[PDB]
Amino acid sequence: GSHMALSLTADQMVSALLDAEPPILYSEYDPTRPFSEASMMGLLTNLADRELVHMINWAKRVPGFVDLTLHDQVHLLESAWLEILMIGLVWRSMEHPGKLLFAPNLLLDRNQGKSVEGMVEIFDMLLATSSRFRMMNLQGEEFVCLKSIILLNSGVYTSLEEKDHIHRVLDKITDTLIHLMAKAGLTLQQQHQRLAQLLLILSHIRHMSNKGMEHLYSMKSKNVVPSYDLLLEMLDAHRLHAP
């Protein structure tokens, strides 16, 4: 059978989201060749490209996403892809104060970011967001809800029925977040305050993603930002993959 996004209970929503989770990838580098030989930007690009393929399959598994037209799915991934990579990074880097866990074989500190121009400012923001989630003791079940909110919210400001559906899907994830906070034993006031602190961090994640896109658009290379066409091609080619 098929569960419609709005029929899901809080526990089914958490389960579906935990199931859809992409795997933690490794940075593609020879551990026998010296670390000086590495490109730094070359490694992050190769990693982001591989992670983006998995993000396609995860998005198609987020409740309410396939209910949207192919056109609208592309718009949401186009606006959200960097924010989704960034939230994943900041979550992985939580237990590593002063370091960013890009991959299990790629844990980079602030000074390493200084190698690439304009990268230091982005690293510092990611580091601050990571420490903030650590202070808040962000839970895995909350992280998946926040990652799903980013996807459905980021490109929502671009038909009243399709617009209401995303709002309703977003209300269902909010209900799931609150449920987790009530089970963790937070009072009603504490529940609202934690929900507000988590959603306020999403504003800073959008900010980092805009600074990230600015950096990408400043690069001399022509195919450094995933275009609408490439994202459409990626979502349509998923139909040809084996389940």
Ligand X SMILES: C[C@@H]1Cc2c(ccc3n[nH]cc23)[C@@H](c2ccc(NC3CN(CCCF)C3)cn2)N1CC1(F)CC1
In the list a second copy, ligand X, none, the entry touching 20 (Cβ below 5 to 8 angstroms by class) is none
- Residue 30 beta carbon to ligand X: minimum distance, rounded to whole angstroms: 17
The piece of 9-17, 143-151, 187-195, 209-217 that touches ligand X (CB under 6 A) is 209-217
Burial class (CB in 10 A: 0-12, 13-18, 19+), 220: exposed
Sign of the torsion formed by the C-alpha atoms of 212, 214, 217 and 221: negative
The interface partner of residue 48, options being ligand X, a second copy, none and the CB cut-off 5 to 8 Å by kind, is ligand X
| Amino acid (1-letter code) at residue 181 | M
Answer yes or no: are the C-beta atoms of 116 and 45 closer than 8 Å.
Answer: no
Q: Which stretch binds ligand X (CB under 6 A): 4-12, 30-38, 41-49, 163-171?
A: 41-49
Residue among 182, 191, 198 at smallest CA distance from 149? 198
Nearest-angstrom CA–CA distance, 217 and 227: 12
Is residue 134 part of the contact set for a second copy (CB under 8 A)? no
134 is in an annotated binding site: no
DSSP state for residue 131 in the 8-state scheme: H
Is residue 104 within 8 Å of 24, Cβ to Cβ? yes
Is 133 a residue that touches ligand X (CB under 6 A)? Answer: no
Does position 17 interact with ligand X (CB under 6 A)? The reply is no
Residues 195 to 224 in contact with a second copy, rule: CB under 8 A = 195-197, 199-200, 202-207, 210-211, 214
Residues that bind ligand X (CB under 6 A): 44-45, 47-49, 51, 82, 85-86, 88-89, 102, 122, 212, 215-216, 223-226, 230
